[PDB]
Amino acid sequence: KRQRMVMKLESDKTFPIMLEGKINGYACVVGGKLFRPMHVEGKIDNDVLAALKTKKASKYDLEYADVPQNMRADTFKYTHEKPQGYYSWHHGAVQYENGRFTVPKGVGAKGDSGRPILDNQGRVVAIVLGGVNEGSRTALSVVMWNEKGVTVKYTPENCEQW
Amino acid sequence: KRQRMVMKLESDKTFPIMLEGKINGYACVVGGKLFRPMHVEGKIDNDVLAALKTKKASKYDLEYADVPQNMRADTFKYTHEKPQGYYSWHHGAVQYENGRFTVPKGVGAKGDSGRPILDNQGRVVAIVLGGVNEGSRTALSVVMWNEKGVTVKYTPENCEQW
Amino acid sequence: KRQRMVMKLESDKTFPIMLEGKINGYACVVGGKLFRPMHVEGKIDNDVLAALKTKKASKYDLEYADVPQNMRADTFKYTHEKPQGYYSWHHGAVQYENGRFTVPKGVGAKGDSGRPILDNQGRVVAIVLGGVNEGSRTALSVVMWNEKGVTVKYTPENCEQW
Amino acid sequence: KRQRMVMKLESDKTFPIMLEGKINGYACVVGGKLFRPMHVEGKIDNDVLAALKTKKASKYDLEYADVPQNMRADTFKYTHEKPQGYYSWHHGAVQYENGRFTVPKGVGAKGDSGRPILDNQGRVVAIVLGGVNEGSRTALSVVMWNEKGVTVKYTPENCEQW
Amino acid sequence: SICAAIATVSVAASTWLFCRSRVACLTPYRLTPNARIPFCLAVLCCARTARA
Structure with a gap:
């Protein structure tokens, strides 16, 4: 059931700009x-x-x-x-594969940059700087952290700033 | 239940100064x-x-x-x-992660230095020399013992002597 | 009944400054x-x-x-x-005669400039830059659009900017 | 009953900045x-x-x-x-003695300058520019008017601007 | 005069490239809760620990 996932997602708060x-x-x-x-x-x-x-x-x-x-x-x-x-994100769950995070098309626009991506346990995996719709899904220009303690920014081709 | 944890905690005795x-x-x-x-x-x-x-x-x-x-x-x-x-301590259970021990804010003050930390089986893990409240939790300047047989003092910044 | 006229008036939206x-x-x-x-x-x-x-x-x-x-x-x-x-305006219906638009005294003030006037069918007739109260009614300095495709601003004497 | 005093207090209105x-x-x-x-x-x-x-x-x-x-x-x-x-004030009743007005600690902060203090009959006695907490009560840097028709500003030491 | 100008331009370009080097070394490792690595500070000293 997605209702419990949404409830867990809507628990923590962020500080808007x-x-x-x-x-x-x-x-x-x-x-x-x-x-x-x-x-x-x-x-x-x-x-x-x-x-x-x-x-x-x-x-x-x-x-x-x-x-x-x-x-x-x-x-x-x-x-x-x-x-x-799949991971929990403020607007909705994020289905990711091949190392890139995808959202349903029509979800996420300007002003949604910087909203963190939470796992099942609430730990933040990566934050989103932007996204581009490329069909049924919409790849996101997220920046992730590597296992060794480094910072990685997977940005899709000709992505859109948010 | 936390009552059993407290009861196990309050079994051993220490020698104050x-x-x-x-x-x-x-x-x-x-x-x-x-x-x-x-x-x-x-x-x-x-x-x-x-x-x-x-x-x-x-x-x-x-x-x-x-x-x-x-x-x-x-x-x-x-x-x-x-x-x-989490580990059991005289004032209360200690929630620790990432190698640093945290206690709920408002717990621990002057005169609480030197009190050991017990694990589930009662073995002493570390003793606390002081602590500083740094938010919802309170990191403690504890001194731990290494696996190789060495001694390590994970001291948070600008800690308070107790 | 004026309730239906008000409901029809309050359908469309504008963009404030x-x-x-x-x-x-x-x-x-x-x-x-x-x-x-x-x-x-x-x-x-x-x-x-x-x-x-x-x-x-x-x-x-x-x-x-x-x-x-x-x-x-x-x-x-x-x-x-x-x-x-008579024509519909955001604050209320506008009674107009002799080519000049009148509203009840005490209606319309500063910050109400630029709000369009709608006809019975929702088509905009003219927009208001300001108005001056001259007694029982208050004429408005609106700018109207002419049949030939020209622009005319019937401004009453000593009008007040809004 | 303090409820009636609060009701009398919350009758008049002021103009914020x-x-x-x-x-x-x-x-x-x-x-x-x-x-x-x-x-x-x-x-x-x-x-x-x-x-x-x-x-x-x-x-x-x-x-x-x-x-x-x-x-x-x-x-x-x-x-x-x-x-x-004691006199009624917007946040609560003000207990005043020895020529200085005091309020309970934790009452009144930044943005509360200019709020008048009313008597029992609603006549304003003085307005407050700021305040400093000195313990159980909090003195306020209020400016009063003298019986001769003069203006006197009783400021506690090291007051805080509000 | 021309030799002095050449030397000064070379030094300025070296400063620009070394600032780029410091940025390129630290920025991947700054954007982390740790943001400190003994090996990199030992090998390049991109960030000055004393300076703040």
Whole structure:
């Protein structure tokens, strides 16, 4: 039953990015590191995180920032391992195969960048920067983390920024 | 049930350290070695144990002393291995992951240094020298023992002495 | 019955203009042309429309912009003919005679400029830049569209900008 | 019963100060005079009040403006005399003694500057610029008016701007 | 003068390329909860531990 999956998915919360009352994206924290896409600009909803100094990634199109120690407990847990199957995402479950994550066509658009992908246990596997519809499914320009502790950004051909 | 866990936790006893009627800490003995934090000063409750000559550790902030042979049987058993899960501690069960021990915020304060951590079978895993609350949980500056027979002090940043 | 007229009036939607969380006015699209009063400044609620390049009309106090072809279908229908009678407007029905539109006194204020006037059939007759109360009714400085394809703005004396 | 006091408190209304959709404070009118703290910046909710020319007070940390005569009737009545006791305030009753107003700790924060304090009869005694908690109660840096017709600002030491 | 200009341009290009090197070394490893690796800091020292 998908209802329980949706209920588990809708448990945790993220911090959106605002620009003049418009939500251009989301800014999540995982493992004590603040993340938000660089191409998406705005002000983070929470003032404290918005006050943090951040640095830019030229080829990765996102910013990073260390959360304060007194708040690092309240962070999402990551997973370098990505078993084959379907994963929970805010809009809906994500069916992924061949190392690339796919969503039903017509799901996800601008302002949905940066929303993390959760596993069955709630650990974040990867975050999405954009996606392109290529037929019945829509491949997503997600950035994943490798087992060794590295960062990987699988971007499909001529993908669309969100 | 947590009642059985608490009952198993409250079986063994430790030897606190007194200073002018004030309990600055505890001095436990494991494997024939007397241990007490060096920054914590006082007199141990047991006259013989307090009468034992001790040596100091500069970078570990604890003392070490060997119990007499007739008393080496009556000591706590150590364990080098720390499988993932939760461990029982005097104030409450300790939820640990990624090699660092966490306790619910608001648990643990000054005078709680030197209290050992017990596993399911009662073997001592590590003792805590201090702790700092860093959010929903509270990471503790515990000192662990390695599988090879070495000693490791996983100390979180800007920890508080207890 | 006026209930049915109000219900018919409240069907279609327009695009407001925002300035620092303040709605200075509305920007309507009719016939493939974007319109907004020039004296009223702000940002259009729709991102795409707000990004469109616009040009100014000095003596008409309004801007014009062409919608993209793929979206020209979803726009309001114009009508050059204005037979005598009463017409529907967002706040309420408009009683018009002698070529000038009148509304009850105390109806319509600042920020209501640019809201279109609909006929019985939903076709837009003219849009309002402002109005002045002259007694029991309040004439509005609307700009109407002529039968030959021309543009006329019947502005009452000493009108008030909205 | 305190319920009746709260009901009497919540009758009158004030005019807040908005800055980019954020309620930075409130601007009250008493006796035909517009007031808002100088340290608090923003735009008044009322356009007419917002358009009024104001002057600044260097030490009093507030601005003053004269309302139009047709609206001077609709203003709050003041009282120079402040008998000992408790007074009703928007967040709750204020217990005041020894010439300083105190509120329970945890009551009142940023954005609460400019909120007036009413007597039993609704006549405003003073308005608060800020406050500092010093224990069980919280003194507020309020500005009162003297019986002679003068203005006195009782500021507790190291107060916090609100 | 021309030799001095050539040397200065070479040094500036070396600085640009070394900044690119630091970025290329760290950015794949910065974007992680760990974000610290003893071996890379030993072999290239892309990020200055003392500087913050």
